[PDB]
Design an enzyme around this catalytic site. Structure first.
Site, PDB file in Angstrom:
ATOM      1  N   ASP A 146      49.475  90.765  59.263  1.00  0.00           N
ATOM      2  CA  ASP A 146      49.387  89.277  59.877  1.00  0.00           C
ATOM      3  C   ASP A 146      47.145  89.846  58.836  1.00  0.00           C
ATOM      4  O   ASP A 146      47.205  90.781  59.553  1.00  0.00           O
ATOM      5  CB  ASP A 146      49.388  89.065  61.470  1.00  0.00           C
ATOM      6  CG  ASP A 146      48.674  87.285  61.141  1.00  0.00           C
ATOM      7  OD1 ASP A 146      47.095  87.566  61.147  1.00  0.00           O
ATOM      8  OD2 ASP A 146      49.205  86.526  61.391  1.00  0.00           O
ATOM      9  N   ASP A 167      49.236  83.193  56.021  1.00  0.00           N
ATOM     10  CA  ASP A 167      48.457  84.392  56.766  1.00  0.00           C
ATOM     11  C   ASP A 167      49.385  85.498  57.223  1.00  0.00           C
ATOM     12  O   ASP A 167      48.862  86.819  57.136  1.00  0.00           O
ATOM     13  CB  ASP A 167      47.903  83.799  58.300  1.00  0.00           C
ATOM     14  CG  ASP A 167      47.466  84.317  59.289  1.00  0.00           C
ATOM     15  OD1 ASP A 167      46.103  84.689  59.017  1.00  0.00           O
ATOM     16  OD2 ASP A 167      48.233  85.495  59.840  1.00  0.00           O
ATOM     17  N   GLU A 168      50.855  85.589  57.324  1.00  0.00           N
ATOM     18  CA  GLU A 168      51.972  86.792  57.264  1.00  0.00           C
ATOM     19  C   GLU A 168      52.254  86.887  56.362  1.00  0.00           C
ATOM     20  O   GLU A 168      52.949  86.244  55.684  1.00  0.00           O
ATOM     21  CB  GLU A 168      52.149  86.134  58.138  1.00  0.00           C
ATOM     22  CG  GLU A 168      52.002  85.289  58.977  1.00  0.00           C
ATOM     23  CD  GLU A 168      51.739  85.124  61.223  1.00  0.00           C
ATOM     24  OE1 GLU A 168      52.668  84.677  61.486  1.00  0.00           O
ATOM     25  OE2 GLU A 168      50.996  84.837  62.021  1.00  0.00           O
TER      26      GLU A 168
HETATM   27  N1  LIG Z   1      47.114  75.974  65.782  1.00  0.00           N
HETATM   28  C1  LIG Z   1      46.272  76.222  64.284  1.00  0.00           C
HETATM   29  C2  LIG Z   1      46.335  78.343  64.026  1.00  0.00           C
HETATM   30  C3  LIG Z   1      46.047  78.666  63.069  1.00  0.00           C
HETATM   31  N2  LIG Z   1      45.827  78.042  61.964  1.00  0.00           N
HETATM   32  C4  LIG Z   1      45.053  78.322  60.588  1.00  0.00           C
HETATM   33  C5  LIG Z   1      43.713  78.880  60.442  1.00  0.00           C
HETATM   34  C6  LIG Z   1      44.053  80.548  61.034  1.00  0.00           C
HETATM   35  O1  LIG Z   1      42.760  81.442  60.422  1.00  0.00           O
HETATM   36  C7  LIG Z   1      45.099  80.882  60.009  1.00  0.00           C
HETATM   37  C8  LIG Z   1      45.860  81.922  60.207  1.00  0.00           C
HETATM   38  O2  LIG Z   1      46.810  81.676  61.528  1.00  0.00           O
HETATM   39  P1  LIG Z   1      46.355  82.919  62.577  1.00  0.00           P
HETATM   40  O3  LIG Z   1      46.705  84.540  62.492  1.00  0.00           O
HETATM   41  O4  LIG Z   1      47.474  82.523  63.864  1.00  0.00           O
HETATM   42  N3  LIG Z   1      44.505  82.720  62.978  1.00  0.00           N
HETATM   43  P2  LIG Z   1      43.713  83.656  62.868  1.00  0.00           P
HETATM   44  O5  LIG Z   1      44.204  84.324  61.925  1.00  0.00           O
HETATM   45  O6  LIG Z   1      42.943  82.848  62.125  1.00  0.00           O
HETATM   46  O7  LIG Z   1      42.782  85.043  63.929  1.00  0.00           O
HETATM   47  P3  LIG Z   1      43.840  85.749  63.769  1.00  0.00           P
HETATM   48  O8  LIG Z   1      44.931  85.774  63.647  1.00  0.00           O
HETATM   49  O9  LIG Z   1      42.663  87.407  64.035  1.00  0.00           O
HETATM   50  O10 LIG Z   1      43.862  85.929  66.094  1.00  0.00           O
HETATM   51  O11 LIG Z   1      45.967  79.642  60.100  1.00  0.00           O
HETATM   52  C9  LIG Z   1      45.433  76.108  61.730  1.00  0.00           C
HETATM   53  O12 LIG Z   1      44.837  75.736  61.138  1.00  0.00           O
HETATM   54  N4  LIG Z   1      46.031  75.904  63.454  1.00  0.00           N
HETATM   55 MG   LIG Z   2      49.539  84.134  61.793  1.00  0.00          MG
HETATM   56 MG   LIG Z   3      45.740  85.886  61.182  1.00  0.00          MG
END
Ligand SMILES: Nc1ccn([C@H]2C[C@H](O)[C@@H](COP(=O)(O)NP(=O)(O)OP(=O)(O)O)O2)c(=O)n1
Ligand SMILES: [Mg+2]
Ligand SMILES: [Mg+2]
Length: 347
Positions: free
Chosen positions: A9, A107-108
């Site tokens: 991730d 992201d994953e």
């Molecule tokens: N509720 C959400 C959760 C994520 N996203 C988008 C934006 C994120 O940057 C991206 C990655 O999801 P995520 O891994 O769960 N969160 P993010 O990577 O931004 O922070 P961390 O993984 O470091 O905690 O999907 C969104 O648009 N609405």
């Molecule tokens: Mg993610």
């Molecule tokens: Mg992430």
DNA sequence: TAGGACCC
DNA sequence: CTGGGGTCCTA
């Protein structure tokens, strides 16, 4: 030999993509979301940097709410085209290490590595982290286990820029005292139902009678909830390309509508924007669904199946407006949405 | 077909 | 005050 499941991730995905082209903001709280204007209402934070997260800003929080908690924060508009290209750079690099890779959102990704017992899965995770770092500039975190859900949970403890191994040797040690929603697949609403039944931890869920969870959640959801508490989950990493079962477009308006000509217009434009996109990817529509939110957030959605799988623009618009008229349409509408369900392919 | 419940 | 885009299960 042992079949390891590795979950990669990306750390603060949208923020890191922006930080990669804005070295001026390296240490400062960066917030991505809704045109970069914190004054705009009905816009939420889609990503907050790790610095902004220490102010309590998280994903889904309204922009003005985030402006209250972190006034010092740089707000950037969301740039999906940049995040998509950074996603394929990362993923087209994760498949070329010769492992089964199941891409899961932007992201994953799940990576399968069938290693000998003498071989450490951390060495594979250590490689993944720095080929991604050296060739994309983005940092990732790897969770290691023998099933997807446990490798996923392991990723939470690996953040940030780290690796965490979770197995049955340390599963209940680490997760036993945690609440149910710490597992992947269980959230606030199930955790509340379990608390009212006396089940408040993963350890208590793992030794709950099956014919107590099944007659409370469903015949298979009950047993699946029990597996998850035991650290089990899905184990097959499939490199097959995912085929979307549907595609959708919803809009929350700045001020709630009242005129139906606007509602008939929004549903029609949403239906034609979605239809044009599924035609480009070579899909055929089977059913048309319309969603209405209303000012009191009362959202219900109705769906109608077409006579035959079609992509005719006149038919799908007529069907979407016909589903819209099926709606009561008394109170002001907050959101309208169209989802086109797609025929499950052929070639 | 309806709708609740996750998740990024 | 509570975005946008998905999927799976159950009633
Ligand atoms: N509720 C959400 C959760 C994520 N996203 C988008 C934006 C994120 O940057 C991206 C990655 O999801 P995520 O891994 O769960 N969160 P993010 O990577 O931004 O922070 P961390 O993984 O470091 O905690 O999907 C969104 O648009 N609405
Ligand atoms: Mg993610
Ligand atoms: Mg992430």
């Amino acid at each position: 030999m042992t079949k390891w499941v590795l979950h990669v991730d990306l750390d603060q995905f949208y923020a890191s993509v922006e930080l990669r082209r804005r070295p001026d903001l390296r240490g400062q709280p960066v917030i991505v979301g809704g045109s970069g204007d914190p004054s705009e209402p009905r816009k939420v934070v889609t990503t907050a940097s790790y610095e902004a997260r220490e102010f309590g800003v998280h994903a889904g929080m309204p922009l003005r709410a985030a402006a209250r908690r972190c006034p010092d924060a740089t707000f950037l508009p969301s740039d999906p085209a940049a995040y998509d290209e950074a996603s394929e750079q990362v993923m087209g690099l994760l498949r070329d290490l010769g492992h089964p890779l199941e891409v899961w959102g932007w992201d994953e990704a799940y990576l399968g590595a069938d290693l000998p017992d003498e071989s450490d899965p951390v060495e594979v995770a250590e490689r993944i982290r720095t080929v991604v770092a050296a060739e994309t500039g983005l940092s990732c975190s790897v969770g290691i286990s023998d099933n997807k859900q446990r490798a996923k949970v392991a990723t939470g403890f690996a953040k940030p820029a780290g690796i965490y191994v979770l197995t049955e040797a340390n599963w209940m040690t680490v997760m036993g005292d945690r609440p149910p929603d710490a597992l992947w697949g269980v959230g606030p609403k199930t955790t509340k139902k379990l608390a009212a039944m006396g089940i408040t931890t993963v350890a208590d869920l793992a030794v709950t009678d099956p014919s107590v969870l099944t007659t409370a959640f469903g015949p298979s959801t009950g047993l699946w909830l029990l597996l998850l508490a035991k650290g089990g989950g899905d184990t097959e990493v499939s490199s097959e390309p995912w085929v979307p079962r549907s595609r959708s477009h919803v809009v929350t308006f700045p001020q709630d509508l009242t005129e139906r000509r606007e509602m008939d217009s929004a549903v029609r434009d949403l239906a034609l924007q979605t239809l044009a996109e599924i035609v480009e990817q070579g899909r055929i529509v089977t059913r048309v669904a319309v969603t209405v939110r209303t000012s009191t957030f009362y959202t219900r959605t109705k769906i109608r199946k077409l006579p035959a799988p079609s992509t005719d623009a006149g038919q799908i618009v007529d069907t979407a407006l016909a589903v819209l008229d099926q709606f009561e349409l008394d109170r002001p509408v907050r959101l309208l949405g169209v989802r086109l369900e797609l025929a499950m392919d052929d070639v």
